[PDB]
Design a protein around this nucleic acid. Structure first.
Ligand SMILES: CSC[S@](=O)C[C@H](CO)NC(=O)/C=C/c1c(C)[nH]c(=O)[nH]c1=O
Ligand SMILES: *C(=O)[C@H](Cc1ccccc1)NC(=O)CCCCCN
Ligand SMILES: [Cl-]
Ligand SMILES: [Cl-]
Ligand SMILES: [Cl-]
Ligand SMILES: [Cl-]
Ligand SMILES: [K+]
Ligand SMILES: [Mg+2]
Ligand SMILES: [Mg+2]
Ligand SMILES: [Mg+2]
Ligand SMILES: [Mg+2]
Ligand SMILES: [Mg+2]
Ligand SMILES: [Mg+2]
Ligand SMILES: [Mg+2]
Ligand SMILES: [Mg+2]
Ligand SMILES: [Mg+2]
Ligand SMILES: [Mg+2]
Ligand SMILES: [Mg+2]
Ligand SMILES: [Mg+2]
Ligand SMILES: [Mg+2]
Ligand SMILES: [Mg+2]
Ligand SMILES: [Mg+2]
Ligand SMILES: [Mg+2]
Ligand SMILES: [Mg+2]
Ligand SMILES: [Mg+2]
Ligand SMILES: [Mg+2]
Ligand SMILES: [Mg+2]
Ligand SMILES: [Mg+2]
Ligand SMILES: [Mg+2]
Ligand SMILES: [Mg+2]
Ligand SMILES: [Mg+2]
Ligand SMILES: [Mg+2]
Ligand SMILES: [Mg+2]
Ligand SMILES: [Mg+2]
Ligand SMILES: [Mg+2]
Ligand SMILES: [Mg+2]
Ligand SMILES: [Mg+2]
Ligand SMILES: [Mg+2]
Ligand SMILES: [Mg+2]
Ligand SMILES: [Mg+2]
Ligand SMILES: [Mg+2]
Ligand SMILES: [Mg+2]
Ligand SMILES: [Mg+2]
Ligand SMILES: [Mg+2]
Ligand SMILES: [Mg+2]
Ligand SMILES: [Mg+2]
Ligand SMILES: [Mg+2]
Ligand SMILES: [Mg+2]
Ligand SMILES: [Mg+2]
Ligand SMILES: [Mg+2]
Ligand SMILES: [Mg+2]
Ligand SMILES: [Mg+2]
Ligand SMILES: [Mg+2]
Ligand SMILES: [Mg+2]
Ligand SMILES: [Mg+2]
Ligand SMILES: [Mg+2]
Ligand SMILES: [Mg+2]
Ligand SMILES: [Mg+2]
Ligand SMILES: [Mg+2]
Ligand SMILES: [Mg+2]
Ligand SMILES: [Mg+2]
Ligand SMILES: [Mg+2]
Ligand SMILES: [Mg+2]
Ligand SMILES: [Mg+2]
Ligand SMILES: [Mg+2]
Ligand SMILES: [Mg+2]
Ligand SMILES: [Mg+2]
Ligand SMILES: [Mg+2]
Ligand SMILES: [Mg+2]
Ligand SMILES: [Mg+2]
Ligand SMILES: [Mg+2]
Ligand SMILES: [Mg+2]
Ligand SMILES: [Mg+2]
Ligand SMILES: [Mg+2]
Ligand SMILES: [Mg+2]
Ligand SMILES: [Mg+2]
Ligand code: NA
Ligand code: NA
Ligand code: NA
Ligand code: NA
Ligand code: NA
Ligand code: NA
Ligand code: NA
Ligand code: NA
Ligand code: NA
Ligand code: NA
Ligand code: NA
Ligand code: NA
Ligand code: NA
Ligand code: NA
Ligand code: NA
Ligand code: NA
Ligand code: NA
Ligand code: NA
Ligand code: NA
Ligand code: NA
Ligand code: NA
Ligand code: NA
Ligand code: NA
Ligand code: NA
Ligand code: NA
Ligand code: NA
Length: 237
RNA sequence: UUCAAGGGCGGGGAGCCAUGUGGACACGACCCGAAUCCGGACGAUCUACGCAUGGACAAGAUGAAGCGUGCCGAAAGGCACGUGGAAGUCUGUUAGAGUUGGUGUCCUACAAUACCCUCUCGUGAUCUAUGUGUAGGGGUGAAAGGCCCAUCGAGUCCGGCA
RNA sequence: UGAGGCGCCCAAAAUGAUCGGGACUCAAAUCCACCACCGAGACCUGUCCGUACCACUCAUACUGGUAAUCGAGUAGAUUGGCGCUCUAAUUGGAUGGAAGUAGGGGUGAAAACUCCUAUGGACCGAUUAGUGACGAAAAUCCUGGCCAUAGUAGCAGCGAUAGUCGGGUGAGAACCCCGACGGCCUAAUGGAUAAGGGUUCCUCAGCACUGCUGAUCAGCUGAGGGUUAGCCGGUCCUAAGUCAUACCGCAACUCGACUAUGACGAAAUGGGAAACGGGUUAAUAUUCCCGUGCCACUAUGCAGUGAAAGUUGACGCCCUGGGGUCGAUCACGCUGGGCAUCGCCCAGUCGAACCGUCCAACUCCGUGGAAGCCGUAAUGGCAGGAAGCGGACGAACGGCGGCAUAGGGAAACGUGAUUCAACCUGGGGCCCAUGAAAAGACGAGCAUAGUGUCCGUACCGAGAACCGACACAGGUGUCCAUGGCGGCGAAAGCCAAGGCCUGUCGGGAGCAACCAACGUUAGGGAAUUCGGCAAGUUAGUCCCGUACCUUCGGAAGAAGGGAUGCCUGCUCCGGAACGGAGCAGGUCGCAGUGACUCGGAAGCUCGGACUGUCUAGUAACAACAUAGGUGACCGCAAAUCCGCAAGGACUCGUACGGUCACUGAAUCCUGCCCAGUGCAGGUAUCUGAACACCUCGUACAAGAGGACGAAGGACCUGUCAACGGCGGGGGUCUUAAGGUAGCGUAGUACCUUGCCGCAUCAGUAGCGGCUUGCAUGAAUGGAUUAACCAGAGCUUCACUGUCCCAACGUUGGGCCCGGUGAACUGUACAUUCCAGUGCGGAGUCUGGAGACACCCAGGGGGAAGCGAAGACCCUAUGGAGCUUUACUGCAGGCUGUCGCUGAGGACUCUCACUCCGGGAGGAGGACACCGAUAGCCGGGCAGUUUGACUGGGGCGGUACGCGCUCGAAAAGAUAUCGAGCGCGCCCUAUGGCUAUCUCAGCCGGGGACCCGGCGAAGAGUGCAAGAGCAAAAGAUAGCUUGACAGUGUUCUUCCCAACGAGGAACGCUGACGCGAAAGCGUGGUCUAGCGAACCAAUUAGCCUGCUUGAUGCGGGCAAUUGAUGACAGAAAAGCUACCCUAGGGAUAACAGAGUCGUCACUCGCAAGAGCACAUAUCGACCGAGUGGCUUGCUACCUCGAUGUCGGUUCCCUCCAUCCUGCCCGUGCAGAAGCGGGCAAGGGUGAGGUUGUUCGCCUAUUAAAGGAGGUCGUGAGCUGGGUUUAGACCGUCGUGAGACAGGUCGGCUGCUAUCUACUGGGUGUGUAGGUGUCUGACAAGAACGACCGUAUAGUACGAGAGGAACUACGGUUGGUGGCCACUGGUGUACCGGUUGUUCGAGAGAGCACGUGCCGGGUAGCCA
RNA sequence: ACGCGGUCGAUAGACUCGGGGUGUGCGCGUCGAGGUAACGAGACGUUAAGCCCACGAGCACUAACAGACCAA
């Protein structure tokens, strides 16, 4: 047959690419020689086309002007600080070690200095639970308990824009406009509505999948469709 | 070969070469005849989808939130009138897009998809120009096996190839 | 009373009867005899030829002879010869005329040779030996040429119907030019342009080409000429993105991703330093000229030290205020024009860039001091300081002044106003959407001077300059959206400016038939049809009023009712409008949204929630999408995906993420099942590869085995919003469960038109209820649902030419004429018709009939008409796309091992290596990555296979290898999906031999046993069937292993007649068994019980392996065992409705043909009943037939195609008669019937469900008969069904996909050559004329039928009831004609009136070929 | 193709009658709700008016002229 849609994706053609050229900034923690002295002033609050969430423009003492992954509650004028000795208030960034356990955090680094990887979407947050001289245990929004180097920097507070998911799109048109701001092919045609040549679920006098939908982890691309390595399906039990 | 016996093959000198010709086998193999398969190339001037930069949508209808005033109320708020002007909202041959019926006209056509009447959409998932990207078991596809220059259940060109 | 001969009855078929025809009757029939004739290529006979043979001969050269016993022939074998090219030898011809060609003479059986005449004007042969791109009627053959077609189709159809009269030029004028008159185009048919074209632009000269006719014209032909820029574009900048170099990959590159650098990337339409006005040319123009202005750079000079921070460039969608120019309009004045019953109507009234100046809005400052005020269209503002007041900053393509005793105008060369595009400047709202960048400019003065190069510039920009082969009705972007009336309007209609008469052939006929578009049709009003398809109705605006249902939004313009003009005078809102809303009075018409513009309405049911998407070119839908619901994977060095690699998408992203799937808004819900399959987790034990390790083996090695054991599997568990499942039986079984809520004859229900009800005269429809559901059912989602819909079905009102039933009219064709001028098609012949025959579907054969030739128009019956090597079906050891637990492999994922790889069955470390960090350093770490390999998964991908037979193929079956009886025709051989039935073993004895013996069955004496008798064979002999066997081939007993090794002969397998394995018969050699011995034993009494090569294992001996010896391990001679049952041996599944090719009528579907079991009808016999009575009537059994309508069979005809069902329309026919006429019987009183006979003249109708044929149903009726014509009729129509591609449901399948199951949607080509007929002409024949006739023959249905009255309340009859002959009146159907009457038309005509234009008036044009409305003559019509 | 007439003529046209179709012309006069006036839809009269006719009659005014040909 023909390569299935999931395979066209990888080639990275226009249709599957994100409108990068239309994006604003790659949100990452600033680099500080040391000392922490680094502080700056919120100059404005903008909309981030890549995350459908607000972002804060900040002017730093040493002249640097960069957009920042804004937590909820940051306003123009506020003074943010980044470093080991940063005060402990929302919007400030400092290593997990210097952060008091029990405090909600966002934009957490996977490894010290990577600029933040975890908890960055609308209204989410990580939860610093345990400290140590060797391991900082954080609970990520997925519920998992992650062990991190206490040297990993983070931002205090939860990400701005919480509750975005609460309102339904209501109409195809709204999805449309959102989708146009992401690296995604939309709308979605069901495999079972295709021809046998286009998808392992395609074909038939009526619409139904050919075999069972749970596919092995070892299935090859072109065949790995449906419920991938499902440990279970349905809702019962 | 065989204890033995019995069988198999061969044996009392005709071949070799040349020329014509009959026939066999491989090769295009008397000649034409078809749907393939494979290789390397050429195409997104059509069209599909995405991107960049521009452009387009008479007029009318309905009257969401919000806000105002007045009345009622302890309050909560409620009621009336106005204001406001929302909507993949309505009417609409505005422009523009689409293509339901007539199974009309045409059917050596005006035309290798046309004409007329009728009909759908017409502020949006809208229409459109130009630029630009994706290439052949690959694209592209709101999925019809649709579309990729009158060519698609695997484009076109030449070659493999007689 | 028996028999015979001939005939008669029995006896019905579709265009015109038949014996070939005529026709025949003491025969021209039939039978018995007879006589004479005709009649083949046979037979006889003369001559000749060929072939074979004989004699003679070198000869196959002659000559002679023989053939009663020689003379046909497709495929094929054999043999002699003719012609062509060029070579060679030998030898000839030709300018006193070669070859070739045309016509003609002679020879040869013939291929072919030769001559003569003419033409031609330079080459040409013969013999012999060679040579070969050597011979054509054919291939839907190739190329070229040519005829018919035919002076035919087209040059008409499009909402753009366009011309006419004069004149000019010219050889020539319908279409070239001038004038007038008349028209066409208004977002275009006007003006400016992008792309694209490329000289098409202008001038002159032309007409051979092109131009749908002509041409003096031209986008044509030829020759000249034409495009002028500091301030318009390009150029410069950067966008999506592209390239180049470097780096790295790759076997390699012209290949490839990333990262650097550089460059490229916008001419209408991104950003951007600067130009305006006038004039000028045949053709350019913000470019030239005149005038005026401006920008940038540089130089000089004065000023200035400022100078880079900032601003700008620079930005989305929706609503809106303010400023404001042009335009348009209004008022008044001036200038010019038009009109002439008034006094109106039209045009103009001008004047730039630029320089200077003014400034609303926004923002801000001071003052002020609001506790309720300020303000808006709206939101809003304020003690954090409202209003007011004063001030800073600050806009237009705008005002104002200059520019300008510039320019322009014949002149005047105005002033105000409203509404205000452009342009300027604000306020508000929206986002799960956030709406470029860079160059540049500003910031940052002024004088003077110099410089400002390079490229583009013509023209078209489209119903003739672009793309579409064309001067193509198609396609093709931007700006002018402000010209007038109109009105909501960028709408219609009408009209300016501007353009055009080139959507480029004309002339003629009241102009017929027929066709395209269209108008109007009385009465009826969907009766039409699959269906209201098509058409029609309704319509604008205001007032009143508005149901069920509902997601409260909607439904809704529901429905329904009323109003609507003009004129006079007014009121209200507002600053006002040349804006809007009303009032009073007057008044005209059939009609006041008067044209135009402009909804028909209501209800029930099905589907999908909605807007949206789709099969460019037969499917717009219920299909796709969607929000919403749900499950799955993943913590980012991720999940998923692309790449060979280097690398990459997702990702400027981070679980409120994004990937992979299912369902498909809302509402109420979503039961049971984990056995199979899938996925996932676990796992004592079992299984599980390679490396390393251990054992054996080998001086090593191959090799065999062990130990250990990863993923995986077994096993266990979880999981169904995972594939999917939810039955039979009883008051459990398969296989886990055993169908819950709902829904239900469904778009799912076979039976089926289910039953009941609604509705209708009548309802296979529709809706409601019931419902056992062939075969409903829960995210394979169930139910239900407001709103929405070019989605499917149904009902009502309204409407109407859909119909009854057609008519008249309008326009363009058609017809005739001038000009232009194709194509399809053509084996030949052809004036046919009826029958027959023939490969069974004939213009051509056979017999008859008819037929004088040619031509014009027509509608298409036939040429199984033209078009297309059938797309259905089968066949081919064809193709492709698709599927899967088909075969075989290949990617990819998981896992063990080795290398990178290091230190001290679990562990630490650091140094490689990887990742994070700018670095320091941090994390990880001998793992991971990468290279190599092993095991598991692995339709993600590739190549293939998936057999044959067959009353087509499939399904079923195996007649696919074997044995027997019969078929099989008394030798042998012999077919079918022929009839009966068997074999794929079993046996150590059930083999072999010898001895002894005789069996079944019956009888008699003491079903065991014993005795006697009869007893040729019926017993027994392993197993089919047939055969054999009695001192045995059987039984009993004993002994034995011949069921032995080796090797043959022969038969069979395979008749004849080649072919292997296998089998058998009969020998020999050797060794044995038993017997006294002869002898028997080559397995079972005979015919079934079987298997190649390659490879392996096995048996005994021997041969052999590369210079040589030893060892190991190989190679071989002979043979046994292991299987190919498709059995003379491949290793092997399906779908295609997306399909494709080669073919086949070798083979199916419709139709034809044959048959006639079936079907229809009849006859013979007549049991029987019919109160008695076979035969008034009904009529079994059985028997004999006829038809060719049904159904089946067959496979003859057609697969280089004979278009399907039904319907429709139009024609002919049959009779087995439904009605009508004439009759017979009756269980015939009458009336009404029942049955039968003759009879085909005429009639046999309208409707409701259904695509139906058929059939059911209703009301009428004299009756509402059946059948044939290719199941008549698609070069006639329709297209509802069947039967393509889309989609759904149920069932089946793992799946692709399947299902005379259902369902929605789904195309109808062609110009008539011949023939046929309907009508019209021209000629010839009879043989100059006028007029009038005749009548061989031909056609008719020209008439069919019914009702009523008198007869008559009569005959008959108890009565009830109730005729007839005859005479009358009328109706219906059909037929022919006609228009006084009624009616239709009547784009003749006359009137009314709306909009607009001509100034009003008068009088007119347009509004589609009448604007609309009202009336309507003639004619034509019903 | 057919039929009729052709000056010894009524065949076609013009004109005038007759017979028909519409429905009362232009202009002028009077009235007219009103309005200072300007103006004024419309009513009545003149007016069975005006306009029109594919038919008939009268009527030689116009045109059926001129003339060609075939023919035993
Ligand atoms: C020869 S072309 C005419 S078609 O063959 C006509 C005939 C009957 O007249 N129709 C059929 O044979 C139809 C058969 C069908 C079959 C076998 N199966 C189906 O599913 N549908 C059918 O129509
Ligand atoms: C069945 O009768 C087939 C159906 C079909 C076949 C192919 C494509 C679509 C439908 N019909 C035919 O075979 C008709 C054949 C016409 C032959 C005419 N000469
Ligand atoms: Cl989303
Ligand atoms: Cl010869
Ligand atoms: Cl330009
Ligand atoms: Cl405002
Ligand atoms: K056929
Ligand atoms: Mg980033
Ligand atoms: Mg919304
Ligand atoms: Mg996208
Ligand atoms: Mg979908
Ligand atoms: Mg599909
Ligand atoms: Mg597949
Ligand atoms: Mg479904
Ligand atoms: Mg499904
Ligand atoms: Mg393009
Ligand atoms: Mg309002
Ligand atoms: Mg809309
Ligand atoms: Mg609309
Ligand atoms: Mg399909
Ligand atoms: Mg012969
Ligand atoms: Mg010689
Ligand atoms: Mg031949
Ligand atoms: Mg013809
Ligand atoms: Mg048109
Ligand atoms: Mg016209
Ligand atoms: Mg010219
Ligand atoms: Mg000229
Ligand atoms: Mg550039
Ligand atoms: Mg530009
Ligand atoms: Mg010009
Ligand atoms: Mg120009
Ligand atoms: Mg043209
Ligand atoms: Mg009518
Ligand atoms: Mg009907
Ligand atoms: Mg009917
Ligand atoms: Mg219709
Ligand atoms: Mg007022
Ligand atoms: Mg239904
Ligand atoms: Mg829909
Ligand atoms: Mg289509
Ligand atoms: Mg549609
Ligand atoms: Mg369509
Ligand atoms: Mg759907
Ligand atoms: Mg979803
Ligand atoms: Mg029902
Ligand atoms: Mg369920
Ligand atoms: Mg064929
Ligand atoms: Mg097929
Ligand atoms: Mg294949
Ligand atoms: Mg890195
Ligand atoms: Mg495959
Ligand atoms: Mg192959
Ligand atoms: Mg077969
Ligand atoms: Mg025999
Ligand atoms: Mg024997
Ligand atoms: Mg083998
Ligand atoms: Mg063995
Ligand atoms: Mg065989
Ligand atoms: Mg055999
Ligand atoms: Mg084919
Ligand atoms: Mg046949
Ligand atoms: Mg035919
Ligand atoms: Mg009879
Ligand atoms: Mg008859
Ligand atoms: Mg038929
Ligand atoms: Mg018929
Ligand atoms: Mg026909
Ligand atoms: Mg047809
Ligand atoms: Mg035709
Ligand atoms: Mg159909
Ligand atoms: Mg249908
Ligand atoms: Mg079928
Ligand atoms: Mg259908
Ligand atoms: Mg003669
Ligand atoms: Mg008109
Ligand atoms: Na499927
Ligand atoms: Na192939
Ligand atoms: Na393109
Ligand atoms: Na409101
Ligand atoms: Na259309
Ligand atoms: Na391809
Ligand atoms: Na080739
Ligand atoms: Na022969
Ligand atoms: Na012309
Ligand atoms: Na819409
Ligand atoms: Na299960
Ligand atoms: Na399971
Ligand atoms: Na089910
Ligand atoms: Na729609
Ligand atoms: Na009509
Ligand atoms: Na015909
Ligand atoms: Na295919
Ligand atoms: Na096979
Ligand atoms: Na043998
Ligand atoms: Na018969
Ligand atoms: Na044929
Ligand atoms: Na038919
Ligand atoms: Na009759
Ligand atoms: Na037929
Ligand atoms: Na038909
Ligand atoms: Na047709």
């Amino acid at each position: 047959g023909r390569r299935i849609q999931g395979q066209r994706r990888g080639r990275g053609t226009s249709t599957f690419r994100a409108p990068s050229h239309r994006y604003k900034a790659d949100l990452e923690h600033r680099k500080v020689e040391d000392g922490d002295v680094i502080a700056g002033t919120v100059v404005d609050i903008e909309h981030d086309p890549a995350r459908s969430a607000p972002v804060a423009a900040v002017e730093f003492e040493d002249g640097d002007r960069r957009l920042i992954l804004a937590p909820e509650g940051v306003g123009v004028g506020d003074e943010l600080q980044v470093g080991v000795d940063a005060e402990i208030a929302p919007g400030n960034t400092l290593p997990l070690a210097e952060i008091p356990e029990g405090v909600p955090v966002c934009n957490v680094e996977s490894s010290p200095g990577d600029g933040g990887k975890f908890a960055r979407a609308s209204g989410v947050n990580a939860q610093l639970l345990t400290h140590d001289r060797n391991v900082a245990v954080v609970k990520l929004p997925s519920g998992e308990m992650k062990r991190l180097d206490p040297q990993c920097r983070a931002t205090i507070g939860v990400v701005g824009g919480g509750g975005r998911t609460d309102k339904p799109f209501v109409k195809a048109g709204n999805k449309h406009h959102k989708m146009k701001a992401r690296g995604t092919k939309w709308p979605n045609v069901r495999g079972v509505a295709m021809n046998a040549v286009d998808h392992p679920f395609g074909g038939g006098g009526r619409q139904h999948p050919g075999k069972p939908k749970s596919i092995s982890r070892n299935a090859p691309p072109g065949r790995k469709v449906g419920d991938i390595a499902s440990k279970r399906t349905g809702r019962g039990g």
